[PDB]
Design a protein around this ligand. Structure first.
Ligand SMILES: NC(=O)C1=CN([C@@H]2O[C@H](COP(=O)(O)OP(=O)(O)OC[C@H]3O[C@@H](n4cnc5c(N)ncnc54)[C@H](OP(=O)(O)O)[C@@H]3O)[C@@H](O)[C@H]2O)C=CC1
Lengths: 307, 312, 294, 296, 313, 292
């Protein structure tokens, strides 16, 4: 298992990040637990969840499933970097005022509900699930600082931010000796590469980790075999090279400059073992060039659209 | 029900603010609760109170009534943006024992603790200065407020009855050291009294505060007083006849007016009864047309911003 | 001659400010101002006034050295407070004035479209080139003063040292917020049109602008001063000199007599009953929020 | 002639930006002045020396324009944004322009190798000498605008006041990040190449006498037909559209004839209908802001 | 009873400060309690104590006595501004164990915890440094105090026995990081000893500190010979006793009342053993000294005024 | 010649400062050759130094100290206005393009430190001035001034000139402790107390008072008892005090200079110091001086 620093900070994390979205909705509590135990045995120390995970009326169930996993003892809590999220409505449909988004009010009520479901007295990485254009950064950093100084959270990360939101966030934190965002969780994969224009550049300038969510573009790059689509040629290129598609999509992300790693979302213990193999592939220079021609990326702005 | 950001901050509030000063001294506990439950159903999430509401010997009774409202559960506390105030003397009226009114750190500490206990909650969402205290410096005030912010006992700080230059001094002092400044100003603003337009509202708009107008009916005067001779206040009627003309109620139009004023978050509506609430609710969605505004403006001329309002 | 510090700063100025009048007769007035001990000269008028001061300094004899010189700042950017307009205005002013520095350089009016970091950029360029010493405002709201000086203090800069506001017996609404702000932040207050355009100069007696009930209060005014043997021109000035935070009024004498009167107004002590009576005739609003709430 | 504040600052400019032999340009600058255009830019659609001699004719020409120039695409330190190149480039520009100050001094392109404390040192030397009033950018990413202006504010310096970016009906990707950042930070947005090098100024009709070679490209350039159906000229509608976009100060126009000037002036006066806007949007789709543009 | 702001801050205090040094070592618990209820009845809201008050093996007795006073309910705690001190050795007199005196963050933590426990309250209003400690840097002291401010354990910080430049340095250092600095200096100031006027009081006034005068009677030396050292100093006590007999003034009341005329002075510490001494202090507050008396007092007891003039020009 | 860092800064100065009163030029050149580099004007004095700056690297070898020179409003005191006019007049009179140590003549309680530092920073940034010092300040004025400078990255006061000698030791209460905390050099002005400590009684052969004659006599006798000249001992006493850079001295001949030089080289005995301390006791620091 390969380890890296999470951007500029002192935290070391596995280059595979255990996504937990499926835990509860598509995978039951006991199988969720055994996937997590198997991640630990594979050296994966970095678990991503969110409050809203679970579905509809069962929002929070994923957090509860991790909660009962930690409750089994065995140094499970001590061993994981636990990451969750705040922004979402925990109620489905339109929200009551201040029960979503990033007001100090919603942050205060969200983190308490999360800590209670997770059965733990602290979150290691608390992440904004999305940018909230209506909350100013002095309000956001005030709320996060309350939680940091109480020992309730350690680090703060973003998800689905623009590059300039990362800049504004971290410049604002630094001005008053706050540690700013330590990571951005962004949609990045072979099919969708527009994060290269500004998000990954800003994150690397500011020393954020980059965690790629939906690394398989929600299954689309993990093998039609179970059946614009010309591209998904990829499959044929891999049949030719004897490479499994889910593995290549993951390993490809591990080659991208500044990417901490993908968030893997395995339903099964076997889907996990597949991801673990993906961290050990070494895609050849030939395969890289082909994959580039099938799935071109814009590269950084302003060149992506100008010169 | 219309919502807006409270000035520049992430907080979303109803453009009607439930005033509560009648809960206790005129309206009783069980009915106060009925009004508040009615406001929630109307989508009103923003409740204003103070420590001093209850009057005379029953100062703090209103805070206690909201306390028992929350104690009934049903997500009442969780759904409400709870605002109260500090500054007022909480002992029997007349001259205060020193540091038992105004805005020393000493009084802020004793007041918030007494309020939280009466309100039966662990935090106030918006804690407001009830008035400016010229004798307390902002480094002292922000120290006190920041202790409360970092313990999780308050989220936001707001002002009431400030001068525009007090708002600037407050927020520039907060910003210099990281702190979120004032997020709202509660000022006296209606058709009769528009001098908050000279400086208080421009300062608030510059600094990104929400503006909450208290006494939106100038103490009844604009809620059909002439037609209820069937405080005292000469040349202080054409208003009523213009509304009788146009087929509008006096109390509804006074509120609908403040809602068109630039930078105004909304009025503090202070119903004694349930139908007076629903009357406020109708005012929220009322639409004053270009013509009646011009008329109302002609009857109640405003000064507009300083220095123009007295100079050029 | 009565002196005060200009607000919080170390500059000492006469409590009479010599404004602009209407070439050889201006020079005579300015020399007589000097000999009366007036050292604070302003070009206050909401091009040639600067030139007249400049020809005054060319005579030598320590006229520039003895004087605190104060001045102020349509085709786009030829008005208002952009850094661009500020540079072109000061350059012209320095050429018209025939001096290499302005002592107090004032904004004419609040410009709600220029941010304070742009304004202080432009002012700091001039300060550090030695072309200006201090900065003041005119026709600001109270909160503009607070904003301006809070922004200045953040980066070590001396902020506004003076506000020039319309302030006289008839118009007292500067007392609501402008003067309190100015006192909080230690700005000198310079009262413009102290006589209210002549209206308090005893202009019923000169009849041998405004006349509904403004007339009645001006009559009750002249009458009171008749009954006390005090000149109307003198009293309106001396009243401002009793107001907390006021440095002094801008006076523009064109004759030796008008100067001599202003000088007498500075040495005039008004009794408590005069003041109580002027206050009855000419009520002030007091400070916000008390002026209009509690 | 419509004026706007440049971004958040107190400078007012014409919403047309006058970009770029000696006698011909000297004459059309004088007519731009007379049409109310005060914003003169040395970006193209020796240039500085032409402007130089124009001022040299007296007549309050310098006093009436906002002058905008750029740092000069190789010997080390003769390109890019080191303090060294800034010093040699501004000095050369002031001599050429025959003036003692530039109103807007712009960067030509983000330089990833120069840190912002070095750039602002250099700009600040020039600000404090009176040599420059404001600083602007060209071809930045959104986050470069954020980092620059957050670095300037930290030490009391005014930051970037403007960004000049490629923006027109055909290239709307400045709308993802560059334009939202500019708006957050109060930069005026100056649209460079507003007619896409010619393509949006009746290019198909002008064939009856770039790459129209690709079939999907020319099918969009439907635009000409829509404008015929409403009786509007393309060279004008391309400019007027940009003037409706949030945050845009104005486009850079390079008129040479009286007719190009008169037509530019008309485009600044043209109010387009919601129907045409909606119609132009269907043809020329915008990406929306990030992260919505590609995530949610 | 006359009130004033404590320097520049919003706190309003009586111009008489109740000293408690006698509560425990001479006055017993029960009579102390009666003097404190009597002080409250006179409108005196400002109570000064110290950890070391009690002397010898009984250090801390005074704080315990105020603690038992608060425990009697009746809004006693809620009505006073409670001030105590840190710096002093709380063990056996004679050289302290290292870090058991002075102003280390270590000694500040243990002293405050012990004071709060003895005082039987969760917070002190004014926590004062009993003396300057030149060995502790201000970034350490303000860290220590800010910890207590943010826990709600103290509100305000004050000094005692500082030099003027210590006041400036402390507050400049606090202001640098948004901390309220010292709100008050408790300095030795009275008729025989006016050298605080040189720099201490000018510095306090510039920085907006309250000035509280301790030893207001120079240890009884200005409270009346008539109950009976250096011949040139007994000389000036006689001229002072002689002058107040002539005007029918009690020397105890004038020494206090004189301090209330000095610019920048909040008020004196009055330290009663008995109820009659307290009533006497209250009458000292109501007294209006005449210009003749002030000018004669000044004639007897000259001050230096401020530096640099006091020694140069 | 003994040299020292001036307070905390990198400038090295002689522990003798050359105060002021064609003959002048000669004693200045003599002082140079004696190794004295620190020249202090403490008008006209300035005009004379300017004519000296004849060439021969004269300006280049000296640390040139002057004063603000402090009536018509704003022709005294420390407003930005008066600072600008005094410095310009001083640079013209001194015939040089920069002053090394520009000093305030007194504390001005009416000018705030943000105004003062604006004026000095202007001058610093134009290269007209390198360092700023004070004269006749209180300790807290030093503290306030230097805290205000440092908040904005400005070098603060680097020296205080205070009245300091055996007779008048009250600078030790607070002025000298503040100076030492903030790393200012202390320049002792009037080191002989107007002439009283330079053998005044034997010159008899300002103060009739028998209490201070008493004191001078015990000093003069003690100096005969150990065969030491008072004009030298009064200088040498100050050079032993903590934080003292050195005294100002104004020798007019080859022979007075050479007595100054010897005072700077003379070690005083611990016995003579204990004896000088008994005759001329010091107040000690505040608050101990008057509290505990
Ligand atoms: N911040 C945000 O906005 C969001 C963040 N996330 C985070 O990122 C994580 C990943 O998102 P998700 O969409 O699940 O990611 P993927 O794109 O990896 O989708 C996972 C799915 O792909 C298939 N799959 C998983 N592992 C393998 C494998 N090793 N080989 C082949 N196929 C495989 C399975 O689909 P099948 O059903 O066919 O078996 C599985 O359910 C989440 O768990 C969450 O923590 C995700 C979405 C939103």
């Amino acid at each position: 298992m390969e380890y890296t620093q999470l951007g500029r900070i002192g935290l070391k994390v596995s280059r595979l990040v255990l996504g937990t979205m499926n835990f509860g909705p598509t995978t039951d509590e006991a199988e969720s637990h055994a996937i997590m135990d198997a991640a630990l045995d594979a050296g994966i120390n970095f678990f991503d969840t969110a409050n809203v995970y679970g579905w509809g009326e069962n929002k929070g169930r994923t957090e509860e499933i991790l909660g009962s996993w930690f409750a089994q003892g065995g140094d499970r809590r001590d061993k994981v970097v636990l990451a969750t999220k705040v922004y979402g409505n925990m109620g489905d449909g339109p929200a009551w005022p201040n029960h979503d988004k990033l007001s100090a009010l919603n942050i205060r009520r969200s983190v308490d509900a999360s800590l209670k479901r997770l059965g733990t007295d602290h979150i290691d990485l608390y992440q904004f699930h999305h940018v909230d254009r209506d909350t100013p950064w002095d309000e956001i950093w005030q709320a996060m600082d309350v939680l940091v100084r109480q020992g309730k959270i350690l680090y703060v990360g973003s998800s689905n931010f623009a590059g300039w939101n990362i800049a504004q966030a971290n410049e604002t934190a630094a001005r008053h000796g706050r540690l700013g965002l330590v990571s951005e969780q962004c949609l990045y994969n072979l099919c969708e590469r527009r994060a290269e224009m500004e998000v990954v550049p800003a994150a690397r300038e500011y020393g954020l980790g980059v965690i790629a969510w939906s690394p398989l573009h929600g299954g689309l790059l993990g093998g039609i075999r179970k059946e614009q689509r010309e591209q998904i040629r990829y499959e044929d290129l891999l049949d030719k090279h004897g490479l499994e598609p889910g593995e290549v999509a993951l390993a490809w992300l591990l080659t991208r400059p500044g990417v901490t790693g993908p968030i893997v979302g395995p339903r099964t213990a076997d889907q996990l073992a597949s991801a673990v193999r993906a961290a050990e592939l070494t895609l050849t220079d030939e395969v890289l060039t082909a994959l580039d021609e099938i799935f071109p990326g814009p590269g950084p702005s302003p060149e992506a659209f100008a010169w």
